[PDB]
Each structure stands twice: as structure tokens, then as C-alpha cells.
Design an enzyme around this catalytic site. Structure first.
Site, PDB file in Angstrom:
ATOM      1  CB  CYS A  79      -0.988  -0.009   1.170  1.00  0.00           C
ATOM      2  SG  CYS A  79      -2.391   1.111   0.849  1.00  0.00           S
ATOM      3  CD  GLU A 131      -1.215  -6.562  -1.687  1.00  0.00           C
ATOM      4  OE1 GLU A 131      -2.283  -7.050  -1.262  1.00  0.00           O
ATOM      5  OE2 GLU A 131      -0.308  -6.177  -0.904  1.00  0.00           O
ATOM      6  CB  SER A 143      -6.852   2.477  -5.570  1.00  0.00           C
ATOM      7  OG  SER A 143      -5.743   3.337  -5.747  1.00  0.00           O
TER       8      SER A 143
END
Ligand SMILES: CC(=O)SCCNC(=O)CCNC(=O)[C@H](O)C(C)(C)COP(=O)(O)OP(=O)(O)OC[C@H]1O[C@@H](n2cnc3c(N)ncnc32)[C@H](O)[C@@H]1OP(=O)(O)O
Ligand SMILES: [Zn+2]
Lengths: 265, 24
Positions: free
Chosen positions: A139, A173, A177
């Protein structure tokens, strides 16, 4: 429920629910220490906390420094509580974060900006210590106050810089988004156009380019196609060198690799 | 190998074969 957070001199609207204790999550506002990331119920509590708190930057080791711009490597086993707070903080601006509670298998790369009060959080990315899938980012986030100024790109770049120095190739990963995808396309296009600008030969393999940028072949091919630079012919594929695009591509918003000081943990 | 679409056509490309860099 939580609509706003006080973070240093900024007051920030949240985009998403994040699972803080309902003790806190029933308030509308949430008061955060900008240095250790403790969350609190009121200004007046925050204020007493700032009088006691010795932190002026993130724990871990400072592995990048260029003037006021740093990156710190924080081990989620060594700073379990700081990394958790940071994951909670991030879920406020991500639709989906896979993991909050269990930050042990992660390293956290926290980018900051220094001024006379200390090193302020600009953003971070998390990394699996040992990723079966060779993900070099789990993230990534730039804080709302800092979005659209070029920082996310420096962060992404810095992720692939760690990858070069480890002699790995990497990718973010899945799933990305939408802001993640927009940001990774812009980065990858740039890496590609840069590469071709400096390359002088009549041919390359996707693999050579991957070995040099630490970008994943599928990500390269995928970007070539987005750029309509992959062509077909006879019975082979060609790369089209779009000079319009390369010259299109030609404020200190860069990561300088001579300002990294790092051994893989 | 890796699959995608170009000018209304299905294609498949090597990541190890050298690709002719070309202009026009
Ligand atoms: C694997 C993962 O972790 S995916 C999850 C990614 N994280 C998130 O979605 C959390 C919320 N998003 C973010 O924190 C940020 O949007 C980030 C980290 C993705 C990007 O951070 P930023 O610092 O704003 O990115 P930066 O300023 O470097 O710009 C990156 C590119 O995206 C573009 N961009 C950024 N935000 C937007 C936007 N809201 N709308 C359109 N374009 C945007 C910029 O124009 C730039 O591209 P360009 O150079 O081609 O002009
Ligand atoms: Zn504190």
C-alpha cells in the site's frame, strides 16, 4: 462517525471508514500526533500530549536524505504500534486495505519533509518482507495535504529504487485503486520514454528493460500498449519510438539515488 | 509470453526476443 482529523496544522476530511475502536470511531473528529501518530479525542488532550512527546520523526532508520526530504525504514515488528496507527490512518483514504492489525511482516517507508519543528509526514508505502508475488509495494499513500505535487511519483520511484539495489524486479500489489493506476501509468510511461531516449540500439527485449528499471515485463508491455508503441508486423512485434511523446516528456520533485544509504534489512 | 490486442487483432509477444525498435 469520523469525518475529520486534526493532523499538525491541517484539518483533513476523511474519505472512508477505518476501524478505530468505537470509543474513538463514534466521535466526528480525531486528534493525531503528527510525529508518533497517537490518536486522541480533543484538542486539549492533543495539546498536553505534544508537551510530553519527544518524537520529531518516525522511528526506524533514515535511509534517504536530500535536504528537507527524507525516507525512514520502519519495521512493523519493532514499531508495531506506530505502524498500526499508520495503517489505520491510511484506511481513511483507501477503499480497501488488506491488513491493519498484523504489521509484523511489513516494512514501512515513510517519506517526510523537515521544517524547524521537525520531520513532517508526507506519505508512505508498505512492503512485505517476503512476498511470494514479488510485490515491491503493498500500500502506498500520499497524505491529502500533499497530493498532486509530485510526491506519490517519488515514492513509487523510490520503491523501484530499492528493487534495483536488491537486484529484484517488482510490481505493486494487485488490485490497484484508480488513483494508484493513474499514478503508476504516469510513472511507467516516464520510465519507458526516458529509457528509449537514452537507448541507441536497434532492438531490446522487454526483459532487458525490466532488468534495468526493475519494472515488471507485464507492466512494461502494458504501458507500451497504453502508449500505442507496440506494433505488429511480418510476424513479429516492433517497438515504435514516438518522438512526439519523448519530447513531450522533456521544483526538485525527484529522488536522487546518490542520497540513498541502505543495506537490505 | 504475454497477451493483448492491437488494431482489432489478438497478439502474443515474447519478453526475451529482441524487438526491432522502429520509427516510420
Ligand atoms: C498498490 C496500492 O497501494 S493501490 C492504492 C493506492 N493508494 C490510494 O489510492 C490512496 C489514495 N491515493 C493516494 O494516496 C495518491 O493518489 C497516490 C499515492 C496514488 C498518488 O499521489 P500523488 O502524490 O497525488 O501523485 P503525484 O502528484 O505524483 O501524481 C501522480 C500522477 O497521477 C496524477 N494524479 C494524481 N491525482 C490525480 C487525480 N486525482 N486525478 C487525475 N490525476 C491525478 C498526476 O497528474 C500525476 O500524473 P501526470 O504526471 O501524468 O500528470
Ligand atoms: Zn506523539
Amino acid at each position: 462517525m469520523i469525518k475529520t482529523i486534526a493532523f499538525g496544522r491541517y484539518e483533513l476530511d476523511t474519505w472512508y471508514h477505518s476501524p478505530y475502536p468505537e470509543e474513538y470511531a463514534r466521535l466526528g473528529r480525531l486528534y493525531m500526533c503528527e510525529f508518533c501518530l497517537k490518536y486522541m479525542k480533543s484538542q486539549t488532550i492533543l495539546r498536553r500530549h505534544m508537551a510530553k512527546c519527544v518524537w520529531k520523526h518516525p522511528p526506524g532508520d533514515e535511509i534517504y536524505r536530500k535536504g528537507s526530504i527524507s525516507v525512514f525504514e520502519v519495521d512493523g515488528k519493532k514499531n508495531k504500534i506506530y505502524c498500526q496507527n499508520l495503517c489505520l490512518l491510511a484506511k481513511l483514504f483507501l477503499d480497501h486495505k488488506t491488513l491493519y492489525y498484523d504489521v509484523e511482516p511489513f516494512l514501512f517507508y515513510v517519506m517526510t519533509e523537515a521544517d524547524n519543528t521537525g520531520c513532517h509526514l508526507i506519505g508512505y508505502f508498505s512492503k512485505e518482507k517476503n512476498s511470494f508475488l514479488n510485490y515491491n509495494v503493498s500500500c502506498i499513500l500520499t497524505m491529502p495535504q500533499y497530493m498532486r505535487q509530485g510526491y506519490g511519483k517519488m515514492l513509487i520511484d523510490f520503491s523501484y529504487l530499492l528493487s534495483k539495489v536488491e537486484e529484484k524486479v517488482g510490481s505493486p500489489e494487485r488490485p490497484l485503486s484508480d488513483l494508484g493506476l493513474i499514478s503508476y501509468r504516469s510513472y511507467w510511461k516516464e520510465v519507458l520514454l526516458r529509457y528509449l531516449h537514452n537507448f541507441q540500439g536497434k532492438e531490446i527485449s522487454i526483459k532487458e528493460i525490466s532488468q534495468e528499471t526493475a519494472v515488471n515485463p507485464v507492466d512494461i508491455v502494458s504501458t507500451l500498449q497504453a502508449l500505442q508503441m507496440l506494433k505488429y508486423w511480418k510476424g513479429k512485434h516492433l517497438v515504435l519510438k514516438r518522438q512526439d511523446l519523448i519530447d513531450e516528456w522533456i521544483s526538485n520533485k525527484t529522488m536522487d539515488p546518490s542520497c540513498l544509504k541502505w543495506t537490505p534489512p | 509470453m504475454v497477451e493483448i490486442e492491437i488494431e482489432g487483432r489478438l497478439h502474443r509477444i515474447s519478453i526475451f526476443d529482441p524487438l526491432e525498435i522502429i520509427l516510420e
